[PDB]
Design a protein around this ligand. Structure first.
Ligand SMILES: N[C@@H]1CCN(C[C@H](O)COc2ccc(Cl)c(Cl)c2)C1
Lengths: 1034, 200, 100, 50, 50, 50, 50
């Protein structure tokens, strides 16, 4: 095939042009996102039942929905939470590769049939099914700098004016309002209601009667009379529009004639549908829109479009309204992509420089400069074909594959130049001879690298999804590089290279280049002499190889494991948890203290703080809060102490002195869609209807047992809330009947006053808005206020709650958990340092085996995937080893010569480990893929050396030792120059300390170490392996 | 204004009409609830009476020759035609007295759109028309957008249905020609191993 | 039994608010009638899988379903693949004139 | 000349065919009744059938 | 999957019209074979459960 | 695969059964499928040997 | 079993084996539907079936 394109250079140029055009089209059309879909598809069902505790929601909503989640395909598991705020969230997690749309529609349809079984209030509020397996692309906050607008006002303005156009922006998949529209709030005064013998039931009935849409009919409607000429639609009672209309609602008329209006016994205003959450941006009231990226969309273009649309909106805003960006990771994505592209470009430039340093020929240096970009563009086209996007994993995979690409180009060009300078043949015939020498080796290398890299794509779960990006990217780049080395590169060598003399090795040159040529010739002579000396005493170096292998095993065993490095993305979080029973005001004071610390003690590092009082992590209540701290640009934060690591630890140390509140600052996970890399996730299941108390007892026993093993388990804690005091109202039903008070009226009054009641809708400025009736805050604060509320009896007398009900204080769960339809409790932990996660999970299982009867357990989250993919790697890599051996045997026509190649694998690996051991890095995904690339490059070099030696032995009468020496002599230069090019290209990644430096260091350090040790060792270990193998099996 | 401008060009546009309905009059009924309660007639009764008599009310199902069918109660036509027929309909009170609608209701005339259209989430109006004999639809669309460019601020236009496809085809024709020419050139260069024959 | 403006405010705008972010959607056209009917057509790109588009439109609609008036849920909100042209008209007459 | 001819050639999408069927839409003023529409429709039917 | 989706999309139009007792029992839409894949029985060897 | 998943679920449930409760399989066609496929594989091996 | 159960006077009792594929049924069997397509009723349909 190489001979075909040497005679047809224009045809090869046409192929290269087609590849370039395809790659360009892909680049213009590829999606761009920080990460691909890594988390398994997940569907969340959210429902709200206002005014109810956790147990009420669980018994009336959660269990009913869970019992109907049947017949849904590819469901891995299901979990649910029922909070004391009246909210239930049910997350159904499905197998990887499941169509998210199909799973979502199946869940929604099973919930459609279960809707009639839910309370009428849940049906009225609505149950929403959403895809929760993604995260926000951006958060656009809106503040007022004048203080003239409350949080509700800003939220209503954003809903009415901003949300629709932002949703219509291209690339925007979902927009979530951080707030709510206006709602007609009726704050009832119990004293005024008792004055006119009224109850919340009367208010609700009056609102329903006097705020409604009534179908009226039509004038001259069909069937008409024989002479009808006019046809008009009849309009009748329509929904109210303003607070004035609602205040004019008539509740009763007294005998004296005085009218009782809704304004008399209640305050009418436009408030928020909910008040649980209070959002502040640097201490000012704020609302916001969370924007998710659409599937197949470009993150950078979508962010630019969103910002442009916001700029277009800005001139029409009310005075004082300002746009901010509390949570924006798009700058981090942009800088990361820029860093990777710069790495590629400087790698190409460094390859050019090394080509010119070694060959001292300009037209030779162009050939790789044309080959490598063509292969990269073809790789982009292949990624587009297979439905991949431009993300961190694929971009770093391309960065890793640069080594193999430049190696192929360098091999072809350098071999052609060597043939030209040795046999003195003109470029065309020299290229023919070189390709005849290396074509079979290149094909075998392609097969071997496919065997090495393909098995990564067959891992299961989220980790499998991560390694499939690298697998596809590197395999496609390698295949395109090999095809280019057989199609375009030989044609370029034949058409562009100038002839070289039969014996010109560069010693005749002057200046730096002549000295370099003489130095390299003498170094090659010394290296060949040393290699011969080694081959005379191969046994000692075989012992040395055994030592190297043992050290490799040592370092591999003692290297810690991880998934992805943490990154300084310009934002981090601070969670505040107050004691059970704490109120919104206390949490707000704690959050204000946190914000003051962040904006005063870290004013050079922190741009803004977005404090959200009302929900945190694994809970939502008045005693929890979360603050999203955005950092200044990395340029404005120079040094180790100004990064997220140091800043977060300083913040945690400062907050440790806060009393009556646990405050913790921490960095984001590498992929926010999964909070993985925090050990193990455990579920303790009530399998025999034991109850909440017995489940709590079992969980306490398990935690106590786990605390007795500090050497294996660290920070084993519950992921939930402890039982909190609750105020029990025992309504004496016989007394209620005796005094002529209906239980329905009692319950309606209690719930509406203290819990709030949604009544119906009203049309405000052309938008439907909810109408809520609740007690004025003054009269629903303390137990004594219960005595301020009266209920009318059939006789017409207002009876107080004390006449037919008692009260007391009990204990109850503010957050009830379920797993797979059964009551459960979630336990988080991690293995002790120096311990693997698998053995920690084994110890947890052993401890759980000794728990009370009827208590089971399960593994969820990352533990479930770990159990799914625990044993996959050894089997797939054994298959990879077998396939590599078979391919090498096919290439060499021998069953034993392959071994001389396969023994090179440790030589690189050890170095990587050392580089990972000294720098303090861990065995993460980037380290593993870099290790694979180093192994591939080492195998390529060994394959070329062995091919040259065996060709000398077979096609010529040269002996084993002589052939080995001549082969290493011929292969030294390309090996050294490729290693130099790749090491220089990855130097920036190793030295990187700015944005994205975690991933860059993880990718670069292992590659550097492995390449250094592979180049140093293989050049005189591969000949040893070849000679030993040929001596044993001959 | 756009339709009037289009009518000035009979030689290019023909049968230019709006695909919509003009604003229609509507009869608004104001039911005074406090008067109804004073007279002892429930508001729900009044609403049911008005809706059933004038708008027709679907009660429940019956069986006709084995098929489930609807049961409707509605006023007879002659008591349902003119606005002054409202007075003939009475509603019983809590004491059994029959109260007229005039005793607690008034009425007026307003105007409203019987069909409101939106395109891409914004209010819109659909216009239909043809190209005059001897003219092509491309020329008709060109003239239509020329006329639309002279409309007040905040009033844009767009093409939908057949016209959207025609616009897309016209827009993407030149790129199709260029790509096809490049592909043929590259194929010739590949086959005949020369840049000369492809150019010639 | 609702005006075109009222049904547009209560139904059409609420529904079409969440009809954004669907794959391969070329455009959307809606209308609201004086009889309370709301008719919203979403035209997608040629070659789009109509089944997947219908499923996605359902997934986006179920977010707005609770926000519609109770009478709308009672009448039923239908999402289905649609065409704008009649394939054929099959009329039925009575040649005896005995049937109205 | 080729460029000149190309620029001046009017554009369309697809030629219109005689498919043996066409439509006639009728719209009366706002508030018109079914009987007036029936009268107009009866006129159209008469035109085509006479 | 799509067949079940369409069937339920048509069934949710009739669901409001069904008797309330029918709705409270739970209407089910399923895509299964007409024959049992298996039968998993449960007994009590001690005989202490009816 | 569905039968295997059901058996795994029943195995998960079994440790928490009340004393005396026990699972049976009064109707399972899976053993027939297993034995039939195994018999055909055996015939293939014996054909190779012959 | 069928011969023994034919002596049971209290019921129609039949033992039977399933086919290779349940849905295919017997290779010589046919399934027929008699439709009331004029609103005749249940009794007239019964008479026609008889
Ligand atoms: N609907 C309630 C009302 C207010 N609203 C606040 C949001 O919590 C905004 O807070 C953030 C900020 C950044 C990220 Cl990434 C996330 Cl997930 C959440 C919540």
């Amino acid at each position: 095939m190489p001979n075909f394109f040497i005679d047809r250079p224009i045809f090869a140029w046409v192929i290269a042009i087609i590849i370039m055009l395809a790659g360009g089209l892909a680049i213009l059309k590829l999606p761009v996102a920080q990460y691909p879909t890594i988390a398994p598809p997940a569907v969340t069902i959210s429902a709200s039942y206002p005014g109810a505790d956790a147990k009420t929601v669980q018994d009336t909503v959660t269990q009913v929905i869970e019992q109907n989640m049947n017949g849904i395909d590819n469901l891995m598991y299901m979990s649910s939470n029922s909070d004391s705020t009246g909210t239930v969230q049910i997350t159904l997690t499905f197998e990887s590769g499941t169509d998210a749309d199909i799973a979502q529609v199946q869940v929604q349809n099973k919930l459609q049939l279960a809707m009639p079984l839910l309370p009428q209030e849940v049906q009225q509020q609505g149950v929403s099914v959403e895809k929760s397996s993604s995260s926000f692309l951006m958060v656009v906050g809106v503040i007022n700098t004048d203080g003239t607008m409350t949080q509700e006002d800003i939220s209503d303005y954003v809903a009415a004016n901003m949300k629709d156009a932002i949703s219509r922006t291209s690339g925007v998949g979902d927009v979530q309002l951080f707030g709510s529209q206006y709602a007609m709030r009726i704050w009832m005064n119990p004293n005024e209601l008792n004055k006119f013998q009224l109850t919340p039931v009367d208010v609700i009935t009056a609102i329903k009667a006097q705020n409604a849409q009534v179908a009226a009919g039509q004038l001259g409607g069909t069937p008409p009379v024989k002479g009808q000429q006019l046809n008009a639609s009849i309009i009748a009672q329509t929904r109210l529009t303003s607070t004035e209309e609602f205040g004019k609602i008539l509740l009763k008329v007294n005998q004296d004639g005085s009218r009782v209006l809704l304004r008399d016994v209640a305050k009418i205003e436009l408030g928020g549908e909910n008040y649980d959450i209070i959002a502040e941006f640097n201490g000012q009231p704020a609302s916001g829109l969370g924007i998710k990226l659409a599937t197949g969309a470009n993150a950078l273009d979508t962010a630019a479009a969103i910002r442009a649309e916001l700029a277009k909106m800005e001139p029409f805003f009310p005075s004082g309204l300002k746009i901010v960006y509390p949570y924006d990771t798009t700058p981090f994505v942009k800088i990361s992509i820029h860093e990777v592209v710069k790495t590629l470009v400087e790698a190409i430039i460094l390859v050019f420089l090394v080509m010119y340093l070694f060959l001292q020929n300009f037209r030779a240096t162009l050939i790789p400069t044309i080959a490598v970009p063509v292969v990269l563009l073809g790789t982009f086209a292949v990624l587009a074909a297979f439905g991949f996007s431009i993300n961190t994993l694929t971009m770093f995979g391309m960065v890793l594959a640069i080594g193999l690409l430049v190696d192929d180009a360098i091999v072809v060009v350098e071999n052609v130049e060597r043939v030209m300078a040795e046999e003195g043949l003109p470029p065309k015939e020299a290229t023919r001879k070189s390709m005849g020498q290396i074509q079979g080796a290149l094909v075998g290398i392609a097969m071997v690298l496919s065997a090495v890299f393909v098995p990564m794509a067959f891992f299961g779960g989220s980790t499998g999804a991560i390694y499939r990006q690298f697998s596809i990217t590197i395999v496609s780049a390698m295949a395109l590089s090999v095809l280019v080395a057989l199609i375009l590169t030989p044609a370029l060598c034949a058409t562009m290279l100038k002839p070289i003399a039969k014996g010109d090795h560069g010693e005749g040159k002057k200046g730096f280049f002549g000295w370099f040529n003489r130095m390299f010739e003498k170094s090659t002579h010394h290296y060949t002499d040393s290699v011969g000396g080694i081959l005379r005493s191969t046994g000692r170096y075989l012992v040395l190889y055994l030592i190297i292998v043992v050290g490799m095993a040592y370092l591999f065993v003692r290297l810690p494991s991880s998934f992805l490095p943490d990154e300084d993305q310009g934002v981090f979080m601070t969670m505040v948890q107050l004691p059970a029973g704490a109120t919104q005001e206390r949490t707000q004071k704690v959050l204000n203290e946190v914000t003051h610390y962040y904006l005063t003690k870290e004013k050079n590092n922190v741009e803004s703080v977005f404090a959200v009082n009302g929900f945190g992590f694994a809970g939502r209540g008045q005693n929890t809060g979360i603050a999203f701290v955005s950092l200044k640009d990395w340029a404005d934060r120079p040094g180790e102490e100004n990064k997220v690591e140091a800043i977060t630890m300083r913040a945690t140390r400062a907050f440790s002195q806060i009393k009556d509140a646990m405050v913790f600052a921490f960095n984001l996970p590498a992929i926010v869609e999964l909070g993985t890399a925090t050990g193990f996730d455990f579920e303790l299941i009530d399998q025999a209807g034991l109850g909440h108390e017995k489940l709590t007892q079992a969980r306490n026993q398990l935690l106590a047992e786990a605390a007795k093993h500090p050497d294996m388990l660290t920070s084993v804690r519950p992921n939930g809330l402890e039982d909190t005091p609750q105020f029990k109202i025992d309504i004496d039903q016989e007394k209620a009947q005796a005094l002529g008070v209906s239980i329905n009226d009692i319950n309606t009054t209690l719930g509406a006053a203290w819990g709030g009641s949604y009544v119906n809708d009203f049309i405000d400025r052309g938008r439907v808005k909810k109408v809520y009736v609740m007690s004025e805050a003054k009269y629903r604060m303390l137990p004594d206020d219960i005595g301020d509320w009266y209920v009318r009896a059939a006789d017409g007398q207002m009876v107080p709650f004390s006449a037919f009900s008692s009260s007391r204080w009990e204990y109850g769960s503010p957050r009830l958990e379920r797993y797979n339809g059964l009551p459960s409790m979630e336990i988080l932990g991690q293995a002790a340092p120096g311990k693997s996660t698998g053995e920690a999970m084994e110890l947890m299982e052993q401890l759980a085996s000794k728990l009370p009867t009827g208590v089971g357990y399960d593994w969820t989250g990352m533990s479930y995937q770990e159990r799914l993919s625990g044993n996959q790697a050894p089997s797939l890599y054994a298959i990879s080893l077998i396939v590599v051996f078979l391919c090498l045997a096919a290439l060499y026509e021998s069953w034993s010569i392959p071994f001389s190649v396969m023994l090179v694998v440790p030589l690189g690996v050890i170095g990587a480990l050392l580089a990972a051991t000294f720098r303090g890095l861990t065995n993460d995904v980037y380290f593993q893929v870099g290790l694979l690339t180093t192994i591939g490059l080492s195998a390529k070099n060994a394959i070329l050396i062995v091919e040259f030696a065996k060709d000398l032995m077979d096609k010529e009468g040269k002996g084993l030792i002589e052939a080995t020496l001549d082969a290493v002599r011929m292969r030294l230069r390309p090996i050294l120059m490729t290693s130099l090019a790749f090491i220089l290209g990855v130097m920036p990644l190793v030295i990187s300390t700015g944005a994205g430096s975690g991933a860059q260091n993880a990718v670069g350090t292992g590659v550097m170490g492995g390449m250094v040790t592979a180049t140093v060792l293989a050049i005189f270990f591969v000949p040893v392996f070849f000679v030993v193998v040929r001596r044993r099996f001959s």
